[model samples]
Structures are given as C-alpha cells and as structure tokens.
Target chain A: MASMERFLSVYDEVQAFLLDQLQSKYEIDPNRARYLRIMMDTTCLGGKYFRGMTVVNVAEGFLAVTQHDEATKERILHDACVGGWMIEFLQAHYLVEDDIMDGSVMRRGKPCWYRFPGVTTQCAINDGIILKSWTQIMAWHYFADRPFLKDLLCLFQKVDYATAVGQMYDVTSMCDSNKLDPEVAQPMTTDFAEFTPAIYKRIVKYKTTFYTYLLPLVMGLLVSEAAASVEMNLVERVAHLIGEYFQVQDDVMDCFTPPEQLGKVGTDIEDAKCSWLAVTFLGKANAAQVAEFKANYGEKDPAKVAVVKRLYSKANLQADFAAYEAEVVREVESLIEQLKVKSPTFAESVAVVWEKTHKR
Target chain B: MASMERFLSVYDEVQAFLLDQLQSKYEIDPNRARYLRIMMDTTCLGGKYFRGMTVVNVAEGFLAVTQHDEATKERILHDACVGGWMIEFLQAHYLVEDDIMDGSVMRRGKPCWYRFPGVTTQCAINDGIILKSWTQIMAWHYFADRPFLKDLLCLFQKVDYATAVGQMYDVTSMCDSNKLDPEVAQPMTTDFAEFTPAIYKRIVKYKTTFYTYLLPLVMGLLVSEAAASVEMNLVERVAHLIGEYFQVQDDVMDCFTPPEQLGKVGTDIEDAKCSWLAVTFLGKANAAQVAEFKANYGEKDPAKVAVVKRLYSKANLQADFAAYEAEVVREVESLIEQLKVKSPTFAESVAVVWEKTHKR
Candidate 1:
C-alpha cells in the first residue's frame, strides 16, 4: 500500500508535464487544451492503478537487488512512475474507445467520455486517439536518452496490436458465426458455437493479459536494465497465468458484484461477452438448460437478464470460480517458487503482483 | 507517374508481409486475419498513392545526388516503399475512425469500413486502431537497425497528436460555442462566431499539413540520410502552404464536385464542417445573406442544402478558390525556387509534390 501510494504521488507531476507539453510543444488551441485537460482527468484517473503500480513495484524489486545512490534511485523511481502512467494512458485510450464500441453509458462511476454532454462520439473518438498518442509521446520525451527506448516502444506497439486482435476476437465471437453482419438495431446474441474455453482463454490472454499484466512487468525489467539477465520466457509464463486468473475474477465480479461496488453496471451477459462464466455455464448445462440460457443470455430486458442470472446461480458458477481461483493460486505460487531459484528479486516481483490478484 | 507506379509495384509484397506477420508473429485467428485483410484491401488501396509516392520521389531525388550500387539503390527504394505504406496505413486509420465520427457512408467509391456488411462501427473502431499499430510495428520491424528509427517513431507520434488536436478544433468550431451540449437530435448548426480564417488554417495545418505533407518529405529525407543537410524549415513552410491549398480544394470539391467523381458524397455543408468555402462566403456576405446562409447550412434537408449551395454560387466561391489556388501555386513555386539555392535535388522533390497539388 505504501509503494502504491508512492507510485501515485508522481501522477500529478507526470500529468502536468503532459498537459504542459500539449500547450508548449504542440501549441494546441486553448479550447482544445481544455478538452484534453478534462479528458485526462476523467479517463486517466480514477482507476485502481494496479497495472501502473506493477511497473513501480517490479522496478523497485529489481532496484532493491542493486545498490544505487539516493539521487539515482529517485530518478529511476520517477521514470518508473512515468512508465506506469503510460500504461494508464494506454488503458484510458482503450476504455474511451471501448465504451463507444460497447454502447456503454457509464464508466468508472461517471458517464463515459462519449456520453458527456458536450463531448459527443466524434470528440470522444479523437480524444481516445490523443490518449493513445500520449503514451508514445511520454515514452519518447522521458526516455529520449534511455538505452532501452526501442525495446520500450516496441513492447507498447506489440501489446497494442495484441489487444486490438483480442478485441476483434471478442466482438466477432459474440455475434452469430454465420451472420457476422447482425443488424445494428437488433440486440447482440451470443453464438455458443464460437464460445469455447480455448477461444475464451485466447481472448483473455491477448486482450487483457498482454497489456494489463505482461506490459508493466516487462517494462519494469527493461527500465531497470535487468531484462537481459532475467528469464523472459518464465516471466511471460507467470504473467499469462496471473493474467488469466485475474480475468476470471473479473468475469465473476461482473456477474455477482453490485454496480456501487464494481464502479459500473455489469453488461457482460447482456452484451453477449465471451466471459468465463458464460463458457462454464454452457459446459455444465443440459440441452434444455442450454436452450433456455441461450434465449435469455444476451437480451437487454431485465426479466431476461434475471433468468440468465438464475441459471448461473443454479449452476453454482461462483463455486466453480472459487475452485478455479484456488487452483490458479496454487499453480502461480508453484511457478513463483520455481522463479525464485533463478532470481529471488524477480520472484519477489512476481509475488507482489500475485498478492494483489488474490486480494481482489 | 513512373515514380508512383514504382512505388505502388511494391504494394502486394508489403501487404503480404503485414498479413503474414499477423499469422506468423501474432498468430491471430484465421477469421480475424480475414477481417483485417479485407479492411486493408478496402481502405489502404484505391487512393492516388500520392502521399506514399512523395516518399519515393523525395528519396530518389536525394539518391540521385550521390552514386550508389544498383543493389543498394534497390534496397533504399524498397525501404522507401515501406515507409510510404506506413503513411497509407496512418491515413487508413484516420479514415476509418473519421467515417464513424462523421457518420459517413461511402468512401473511395464503396461503403465505409464501418458500414460493411459484417464489420459495423464496433469492429471498425478496433480495425482503425490495428491499422495505426501497424505503422509502429512496420517501423520497428523494418528499421530495427536504422539510426533514424527513433526520429521516425517520434515524428509519427507528434503528427498523430497534432492531427487529433486539429480535429477537435475543427469539430468544436463548427458546433455552437455556448451550446456544446447541443441535443443529439438537433441538426448541427454552424457557430459562425467561432469560424474564422485563422482557425480554419490552424485546423488544416495541424490536421492535414503535418501528416499529409511534412511527414512523407521528412521521412524520405530521414531514410535517405539527408535530413540533417536539408533545409527542414523551408520544407515545413512549403508543406503547410501546399496542405492549406489542398484543403481549400477539398472544401471547394466538397461543395461543387459530383459524388461519383469525388468518390463519396460530400457532407461538409450538412455536417457543419469548418470549411474554406463557408469561411470565405461568410467573410463576403452582408447581414441578410449571413442570416440566410446560417439558416440553410447544416440542415439535413435537401432543399436547405440547395439553398446553401446557391448562396455559395452567388458568392462566386469557385472564382475565389481559383484565385486562391493560383496564388498558392505561385507562392509554393517561388519557395521551391528559393530551396534550389540550398539543394536542387531537395527543390525538385518539393516541386514534384507541388505539381501534384496543382494538377488536382
């Protein structure tokens, strides 16, 4: 908690630098500057900052293994904060665009950027692009002299590409397989044929894992110049395991958590999302139950949504998720133990992330 | 024309490389790969290849100054083609997102990507992002060993930021200043209070000039290892001049050109776009004319659109555009001539772009 708070302390400075750069370097009109100011405050803040703090925590873990002067440590920590914020910026970009794509109204306890009175979809689209651009800009400006700049940029690019591919899979899997062109007016219906466990895992890994879990850890290693010494293949393996575990929790929360606690309304079932809960429910259901689930799963009507929830309850999906979560925790702990043999510092970094995932 | 043809001859190979990378490197699903394939073919192709060709022509101009082996020349040309395609990719990204933002239908003589049978707005948004990511991926893959790779990436980042800022300016200037929260149901009314030549030029320079003109030229110079030796300030000045002129032509064409020839229906007037013709017409009109123009402008009704068109004709916008075009041509020509004093090859490259802008 102390580390997380310390990581967040630099957000204001990082944001101020970005806002200043927008005016001084880009010379954007005063009006546009105001739009961006509001955008950053709304979309970039108000998150758990988990993905970002991972960068800081992991970097700190690596820094702990090596001795450094106070001044050098402060600079590295500052850079880690900026690196963390870039991930936040990237997340904000995805959230803004994803809200528009999903037709979502509220996000992070407020109306989505697109739903704001004056912003509209047109402004929000550009705002999303601007947010994504800042990730690169921040990277370039702060890491101009850093030796690992290319690696950092390439990592962001690859992760972005992977996430977009994942989003494509998620969207297409939700619509009828044969009828990719579902009418815009019609509510989206899940295509059970397309919603296999393998596909679900693929979607989660690409869409959520790469950006949310792997990016920050890898960035930390790269920034600390410890990437070369670390076993990246193992890092990737542990990251994927933890990422998959994290997403299952998300799916469970989406189904069970209240809007007040969750920060937004859960629409996964109504939106026909390729969620773990949906896939598990389908796997366990009888033919009659399958038919009923399919009919009620994606309908926007509250009555229909309730029917789907009843099916989930009857199937004991929460119990299944609890077992799955426990199993994943054991497996991840084993992997971290294996990693400790190679480097305890790297293992500790992985454990720091693991602790957070389990707490949620 | 030969240079453009040569530049385009490499398109098939480039597309194949990107497509294969999707499968081999990213290992995306076959269905998603197919979606991206259609997207690239539809959105990246069919343009004049003018922007891409600028890279080729400018690089060739620099290459002409110093002798190189045939193989070396071929390799450089190939690299130039890749660089050019990155710009095309960037443009495609903008167009896909822009079509959604503008509520546009047809583009390049067919339906916009979002309006495709299966894609819709949701898929198109992600597709746009994927296209943008490809620019960076292509840069990283092809220029991994190049010294100017950082410069190239930063340049793309800055341009993307600037273009988004410009878009925000353009969108806001068209809508009511005091009523930024105008009802979505209301027809977008032009706020002439925010419309001025300065703002229009700012929009064009940031949105159009940096990416459309300066980027390709600078990219070409960077690839050819001649950017340091060349007069970049003059390059920027000439590019902005040409970009501004190009947009004025765009505004004029949007008002006058047939949909078939223009390859899409023009909605600038109906969309309440901050267009050159409207700015000029407003500058020349009296109070009654201004009142009439505002009433007719931005209405979805055909009769109201016709009223706005007649007002434009009455003001002789075409004549004004012709004068403006000629003056811009002369100014660009003189600037190119001045550039000849620094490097004739660079001057000729600028002239190549100037010729195309005039021919259009």
Candidate 2:
C-alpha cells in the first residue's frame, strides 16, 4: 500500500477505536456522546497528519532495521499505529486550546471547534481537556505492558510540558509593547519593549520543535522497541533543526501566503506574534525604519499594516527567508552526515520532514 | 498528629512536590510558571479538601488492616498522599472549568479563578487543562512501577469520564424546558418541560457520587494494595449511597438553607436544576400546582421565584427531606450490615464518610 494510504488507514483504525470507546465503553448518554463525537470529528481530522505519519514511518524504519519476526512485526505495527494516533491526540488537544486562546474563527477550513454553535468557548475548553486525558488513557490501553511504557509516559509528559511552555511564550509575547489596546489584544503576562531573535528562537523550539518535529520520532523509536539502537540526542538535534526550519517557513507564509492557501488569514501582525519577519525587520532596519516598524507592527490601521508590509519589502525579507532556507539546508545536511553512521534511516527521516515542510 | 493535621501535612507535601515540579523540571519560563502558581494557589487551595482527606484516611485505614513493615508503611503513606493529591487535582480541574462554564462569580467565598485580575475566561480554560495534565504526570512519577499503577490510571480516567458525563447531564438538564431565554440560560442538550426524578438520580450519582464520594476511597484502596481484599462492586455500592444522600442533602439546602450558611444564594430554582425539590414538587402537585410550577419553576421574577418557593413550602419539601434522611440511614445501615460481615474496615470507612457528608 502507498505510504499516505497506509497513514490514513492506520488513522482510521485509531479513529474507530476512539469512537467506539466513546460510544459504548463510556456509556454516556446520546447528548453527551454527540458533543464528544462532534468535538473530535471537527477538530482532530483533516490535518496533514505529519505527526501521525512520522510515528508510523519511523516505527516501520526501526522494525526494518531490526528485522524482527513476523509475529513481532505485526504486534509492533499495531502498537506503532496506536502511538501514531496518540501523537494526533496530543496535537488535537493543543490546537483546540490554542484556537480558543487566539480567538480563531476558523481552522482546517471550518469553524473553530469553540466557534461552532452550542460549543461556546467554555465547552471547547472542557473538550480540549477531555482530549488531553484521552491521550493518556489511550496510551495506557495500548502500551501499559511494554517494558518501556514508563519511558513513553515520561517522554509524552515532558514534550507536553515543553509545548505548553512554548505556547505560553507565544501568548505572553503579545503583551510586549504592542500599541494595540490591551482589551482587544490577547492578554499577555509581561511587557517587553522588543522581541529579539534569541527570544523568537526560544519560542519556536518550545512551541513547535519538540512536539511537532521531534516527538513523532521519539514515539516511533520507543514503540518499535529500538530506543537502544539510536542516540536520541542526535535524533533531537536533527529533528530540532528541521522543526526550526519548519516554523520559519510558517512565519514567512503568515506574511506572504493567501488566506485561502493557508486555511486561515495570517494574524501574526494582528496577534502580536514574534514572527520571523518582525525579528528580521528589526535587525536590518535603520532608526526611522525601526520606528515605523514598531508603530505599524501591531497597529490595527490598514494603512499602518501596509506600512509594515512596505518595511518588510524594504528589508528584503523574501531574500532573508531565502538565506534562512539555505542555512537550514546546510545545517540539516551537516547533521545528517553526523548521524549517517549511527542511523541512516534517521537521517532519511529528517530529510523527508525537511522536504515536506520546506516547500514554498 | 490529629487526622486533620495529618491530612494537611500530606497535602503540604503534595503541594511542595508539585510546586517544585512546576518550578524546575517543567522548565517553563518564570511568567508561565507564575500563572500556574497563582492558578493553583487560588483555585486548588481553599477547597475543603474532602476528596483529598478521603484518600488519605482510607489509605491510612487500609494500611492499618494490612499492617506492613515501617519502611513499607512509610512508602505506602507517601504514595497514598500522592494519590490523594491526584484526587484534589482532579476536583480542582473540574471546578475551575465548571466555574468558567457556569460563569460563576465566586468559589469558596473568593472571586472565582477566572474572575481574578489577570485571568480571562479564555486563560482560565487553559489553566484548567494544564492542571488536568499535571494529574497524569504526577501519577507516572510516583506510581508507574506499582502492580496497581495501570488500575490507578484506568480508575482515574473512568472517574474523570464519569465526572464529565455527570457535568454534562447537569448542564443539559438546565437546558430542559426552563422558561428563561437561551441567551441568558446555560446551554442544554435536551429541553424538558419537567425533570424526572430518575434523571436527577443519575446526575447525583455521576457528578457527585463517583468523583466526590466514591473515587477517593477507590484511589486509596487501589494504592494501599487492597484491590484483592475488597470487592470494588460493594465499595461502589457503599459510596454511591453516600454520594446520593449527600447530593439530596444539597438539593434540600439549596432552597431551605440561608445563603450565609451555604455560601451562595440558592439558584437551584433560577438555574433550573433537577433539584430534589423540583422533582418532588412535580410528582406531588395537582394540575394547577403543576401549571404554576412550570411557569415559575425557572422564572427570574422575584414574584415568580417566590411562587416556586411557596410551592416547595406547600409541598413540605423539608419534611420530605426528613423522610429522605431516614430512608438513606436505613438503606445505609442495611448495606453496612452486609459489608461488616464481609469487610468491617470498609464498613467503618463508609460510616466515617457518612458522618462527614451527612451533617444537618
């Protein structure tokens, strides 16, 4: 079977398993069951499933390298798919909470889960929490007896903690000296006059890297019974670089891409996100340019927004992203070479993620 | 130490352990950490800690029956306290989310956590979620290796699911044929012109009985290595009766008790709850009284609210509660008779909980 089909098929199995659990084992009334069904149906589906596929593909890679017996291979594959579903569960839980935090109107080309009728922000909040609990429950069901089950639990929690911290940094970054009124703007924790590239890096790594790019590999390795075969430090290093590249790509798209293409209007400027373009503009601009950037960066005025756009043009952010792309290529290639002897499959997996996320 | 003091000390240990975990190993930035700290401080603290105390007391009881070496006892006590803390965490998570969902103004005589200066409903929603995740991580940290660890995970999830369903029933029951406008009223799943006594029973059992009454003992029993000794079926039976009795007591208090005593004005009428009074009033009333009940049962007018109060008075709900208290005592005494022959310690445990929640 084709890889994408295999991914979807496995996802289907997980989806069915989850829905059955909700439908019967939970013994919830139809009304309550309906709410959960809608919550998962709308929020968890339709994503690219990069995280899920990563679990499947890497687990497959591990099994191939180890050349386990057929029975063992079958058992590991089922477990790996369960692990894949878990990664998706993690992503869904985070995104549901995030869309509410951002007051997003849409996601995945439909109304945000919270925005759907009868699912006010409060219900969505609870739903997000229900999903978070589901992740652990599902993991225990699938992997509780494995020798490394405790390790998987630790990894899941650690990465969840990292993702939350990253999200916090992103949320709090909105408070930094943006001229937008505090009422309309997202509530932030502290004020900063400027957000440097250093801060941006921290936000990116925490919010995106660990869970988005690195965790799938970690889960795959753990589930495939191959944690001993690879140096996870190198795996993190490789995936982290890819993740950084992936996020920078998103930042560029936020400013440059069409809402239709991206599934939602870009709100980096409006949301006061610490975008790559904002940090890059800060670095390259003159004093007046910097002044103009600050005034227009988080301004509600369309004309000021246009002014920020012009500043980005003046700073040649498109060219800067180009350099970023090149730098990412060099860094990833170098890391893959370092990893080549220990695990070429890991190197290949890193390359695959880079190409998938790196596309313009 | 006295029992209350011992409970407080164990809770203190859990608090210190949790704060240390949040402060360091999570590696969150100070700002994010501050938000969690304040959230836990305001929301998790200040509660009566009945659920936590139940776990601790029950654990202490189990340990007494199954005496162990001092080191083993000490280790189990610490683990039991950890389990106790997990119960508290679950309760706090639900309450925070419940407050936001209900748009409550106060909890435990302070402004609700969502009402604090820095907290928006959106942030509170996520704070609730972060606490939910913390419960599992704490479990993994302390109980991952125990023979009963999987049982703990299963029980926690099952109880959480039960709690969520109960909350759903409560929420949906409010949506039933309550005359208030949809905008002002909390959203409900199924609108009913009259709430049934059976439905009220289900709500009490799920929302209050399992998590609030049954679960603490369940946790304590599982963690103290008494799963083999106790019949969980009988345990649920005992706790469910107490939980049901406790909730019926609450329903009576909603209308009969003063706001000062209960800490809030009785909104069972205004909120259109499936209160015991509502169900009893429905069952006993004539057509005219029924019509009057429908019109004013959920009405917001002071005169209408007064009308419902007069109906409750006319129906002698206070006397009915007196009867209910008798029925509960007789039924519980019967259950204890059976349980005493089987497990005297369990019977004693139930008696202790009965006294705690069964106060006049």
Candidate 3:
C-alpha cells in the first residue's frame, strides 16, 4: 500500500486510541472533552502526514531486512504507525504556541486554534502544554513494556528539547526592541550586509531540522533492535542537511512564491525574522544597494515589499537559491551512497524521506 | 543530615547542572540567557522546597533499608538529590504558566515572572516550554542509563499530564461567561446551592494531591526495585489525604486568615474559584442563607466579600474545618500504621512529609 494510505489507516487507529485515553483518564465532562477534541482535530489533522509517513517507511524498511511475513509486517506497521502519529501530535503541539508567538492568524488555511471564539493566547499556551504531555502519555501507555521503550521515550524528549531551544533562539533574535543588533535588528534601514549566514544555519538545525527530518526516522530505528544498528548520529547528519535544504526553500518561497502556494502571505520581512534571504542578500549587496535594501525591507507597505522583491531579482537570488539546492542534492546523494554500504535498509529508508520531501 | 539540609545542598548541584545544559544547548546569546536566568531564579527558588525535599527523603529512606555505608549513602544521596531537583525544576515550569492563566500578580511575595520588566505574557508562554524541555533534558543527562530511568521519566511526564488536566478543569468551570451556573457563575449574591462538591474533589486530587503530595514519594519509590516493593498505590493513598488537608487549610485560610499570613488578600471568592468553602457553604445553606451567599460570593466588593465571610461564620465553617482536620489526621495516622507493616522505611517517609505539612 502507498505510504499515505498506510498512514491514514494508522492515524485512524491512534486517533481513536488517544481520544479514548482522554475520555478514560480525565473522565472530562462532555463540554470539556469537546473543547479538547476541537483543539486536537484542528491541530493534528489536515497536514500532509509526511512525518508520520517517514516513520512508517523506516519501520517497514527495517522489517524488510528480517523478511517478516505479511501478518508480522502488518502488526509492526500498526505499531510503527502509532509512533508516526506521535510525530504528528508533536507537530500539532508545536504549531499552537508557534502561531501565537508569531501572531499568525492562519495555519493550514484556517484560523489558528487560539483564534477560535472565546479562546485567547492563554488557551493557546495551555493547549501547547496539554498536547505535549498527551504525546508522552500516549507513547508511554502504548510502548512502556517494550525493551526499547527508553530509546523511544528519550528520542521524543531529546528532539523536543532541541526544538524548544531552536524556538527560543528564533524568538530571541526577533525581540521587539531593535537594540541587540543595531544594524540587523530592524534590518529596515541598515547594512543588510551585517546579517550572518551562520545564525541562519543554527536556527534551521535547531528549529526545523531536528524535529522535521531527524525525529521521525530516529523514532522508527528505535522500534526494533535491527534498526538500532543504524547509528542515530549518522541519520541525524543526513537529516540535518536535508532539513537545511527544506527550510532554505521555505525562506526562498516566502519572499518569492505566491501566497496561494503557501496559503498565507509571507511576513518574514515585516516580522523582522532572521531569514535565509536576509543573510544571502547581505552577503552580496553593495553599500548603496544594502542601504536601499534596509530602507524598505521591514515595512508593511505593499509598495515597499515590491521594492524588496525587485532587489532580490536584480541580485539573482533565484539563481543563488537554485545553486544552493543543487549543492544540497549532491551532498545528500553522496552521503546516502556511503550509508548504503554500512546499512542498505537504512539508506533506503532515508531515500523514502527524500522522495517525499525532495520537491526539487 | 535533615532532608531539608541535604535538599538545599543538592539544589546547588542540580541548579548548576541545569544552568549548564541551558547554556551549552542553546548557545543562547548573553542577552537571552540573562532573561531566561531571571525567570529561572525568580520562579524556582524561595518556595518551601517541600516537593524536592520529599523526593530526597523517600530516596534516602529507601536506601536505609539496605544499610549502605556512609560513602555509598552520600553517592546515592547526591543522585537522589538530582531527582529532587527534577521536582523543583518541574515546579518552576508549572508556576510560569499557572501564574499567567490564573492572572496571578505575585508568587512567593514578588511579582510573577510574567510581570518582570520587558517580559510579556508571550515570553512567559515561551519560557514555560523552555523550562519543561530543560527539565526533561536534565533528567536524561543524569539518569538515562539507570535501571529505573523509564520509571522516573514517565513519572515526570504523567504527573505533568495530570496537573495540566486539573488546571484545564479549573479554567473551564470559571470561563468568561456566567451561563454554566448563572446563579453561582456570577454569584453576585445568589444562593450557591448549585455547587457540586464532587468536582471540587476531583480538581483537588488531580491538581494538588498528585503533584503536591504523591509525585515526590513515587519518584523515590522508583529508585530501586527493592524500593519499588513499596506499592505506589499505597503511598498515593496516604499522600492524597495529607494533600487534601493542606489544600483545605488553604481554602479555610483564604477567607479567615489575615493577609499577612498568606502574603496577599484572599481573592478566591472574587475569582470564583472551586474552593472547599464554596462547596461546603452550598451543601448546608438554607434557602435564605443560600440567597445571602448568592449575593456576596464571587464579587470583588469588600462589602460583598464581607457578606460571604459573615455567612461562612454563621454556617459554622471554622468548627467544620477544625472537625474535618481532626478527622483527616486520625484517618492518616491509621493508614500510616497499616503502611508501617509492608514497608517501615516507606512509612517513616510518609511521616516525614506529614510532619512538615500538618499545620494543625
């Protein structure tokens, strides 16, 4: 079966499992239960299910090494899918607070959870805490007796820590006052040249790479001892590169792609975010070009946003992005080639993720 | 050494351990680190350290069963202290968001962390996530390889889940509208006959009893399989009673004690809290007395609050509180006598917690 089809089936099972848990544990009143369910469905569903899909693929690939029969494969697939849903739940947990922090209105083309009637940022804060704990509780309930339970439990936790650190880094860089970086802080009318590429790399590794690419794959590896031979750091190394490629594409698309594609207009500039675009332009722009770039970059005016777009085109940033994407592709392919020698199944599992998110 | 003394010393070790992890993991800029440290110091320190001390006491008590040498005891004490600090870190994490959701202006006699200069409710939300992750990260760092790591890790997570569920229950009942219990929801002088004592009991068990009383005892029980022989359910039974007593005292004191005793004027009545007093008053009020309670309870007016206070006196709440306290003490003493047979060390541990919290 197709990965998405497999994932949807698993999603149905785990969603039912989790909701049943919410009912039994809390014995929450119908009104309260309904509220919790609304937050769950709104946040966890409607995604592409890529993270969950990656998990199932990796688990299936590892099982192939042992040549499990159809029935055995089915059971492991079901178990693997539960792990997959974990990633999905975590993603939901993350977006709740992230949207609030970014003052975002729309996610997945609908109002953010906090924007629902009578819900404020306070509920958004509470929901984030709720979803995170719920993920841990579900994982423990399902897998607590397994020998690799620690591996699975600690994997979820370490990834969470990495992601939260990344978020704090992102928020710190965008603090309201422009005092930290007099030049790059506002970036509106300063030397765009001052923005460092290193911070962009750091931000992506923490915020996007660890959870987005590494988490799902690593979780599957911990599912069985055979997969444990697939050194986690090696997988993290590969995932980190792909995560960079994925996030840089997002940064590029934010400034250049249509709102229709992303379902929300890009606000990185007006939000004074530490975007890959900002660092790249700063690296290439001349003194006068940089001065002009800063003057209009962070403003809300449609006219000013247009000016920034023109500057990107004039600077051949599209070409720059294309070249970066190519380099990323070559590096990832070469790494996977090496990985194939040590563990062909591991390499194949990674390639599954690549095929899904490669986009290029 | 006394449990408190050992806990304070271990507090220094764990404090340094956590701060180091926060620094190295985020490589957070000095500015962001400073802001985070401010929140950490403000929230984690200055509390009575009851929860952390219980973990230490229980862990040490378990070890005494084996009669380890002095050096062995010191080593285990240090490790147990790390577990102890885990409780402290978790407590700080809880307070950050709790203060925000409750609209609490002060905690431990100072402005809440959210009220710190240059901090907003937004940062408070972010910090809560950061602290929660940091606690997990520290636990993994210190205890990942230990035999009972899963037990300890899952304990932290499960307790967190219970606490958040309780907080949500409390919030939903006091939502912005006055519709759920039009008479008592606004309670601007309507009879409180509609109050359900059962819900109040549920909230207390989840929110106060589990985290406040059971969690620390359970953590130490999970330290060794021999210690694990002390059934967690048995200990939970004892802790729940002490917790109820402690919380009931809080409810009684909120109205009856001077502001100087608790460090702030009681606002439970005005805040429309799910308190013992409210449920008790609702249970016994005559029709006219109910009408008097409906008018005065849950109002900010001093005269209205006075009206509620007068009604409590007329209903003989003080005598009721005293009688309830004596009954609880008698029941707990009897339970501890039974616990003393299965596990003498565990029984002593319970007595330690009881002595600390049994104000009467």
**Could you give the TM-score of chain B for each candidate, in order?**
0.94, 0.92, 0.90
Which residue pairs of candidate 1 clash?
A: none
Tell me the spans in candidate 2 whose CA falls farther than 4 Å from its real position: A10-16, A22-25, A176-191, B10-13, B175-194, B297-303
Among incorrect, acceptable, medium and high, the docking class of model 2 is: acceptable
Q: What C-alpha lDDT, on a 0 to 100 scale, does residue B168 get in candidate 3?
A: 75
After best superposition, candidate 1 residue A55: deviation in angstroms?
A: 0.9
- How do the residues A133-228 of candidate 2 rate in per-residue lDDT, one tens digit apiece? 677777876776898787887888778877876776676666642332212434432323447877888789888999987889888888877777
lDDT of 3 by residue, B77-196 (tens): 776777777777777888888887677777656777777655666566777787777777778887767787777787788788888887776665445323332112221224343356
True lDDT of residue A72, candidate 1: 78
So what's the TM-score on candidate 1?
A: 0.95
Q: Order candidates by lDDT, high to low.
A: 1, 2, 3
Q: What is the DockQ of candidate 1?
A: 0.50
TM-score of each: 0.95, 0.91, 0.90
Residues A139-194 of candidate 3: C-alpha lDDT, one tens digit per residue:
88777777767778777888888887788767655553234331222213253433
Best by TM-score: 1
Scanning candidate 3 chain A in windows of ten residues, the lowest lDDT window is A180-189
Model 2 alpha-carbon miss at residue B22, Å:
4.3
Interface RMSD values, listed in order for every candidate: 4.1, 6.2, 6.2
Model 1, position A250, has a per-residue lDDT of 86
RMSD of 3: 4.0
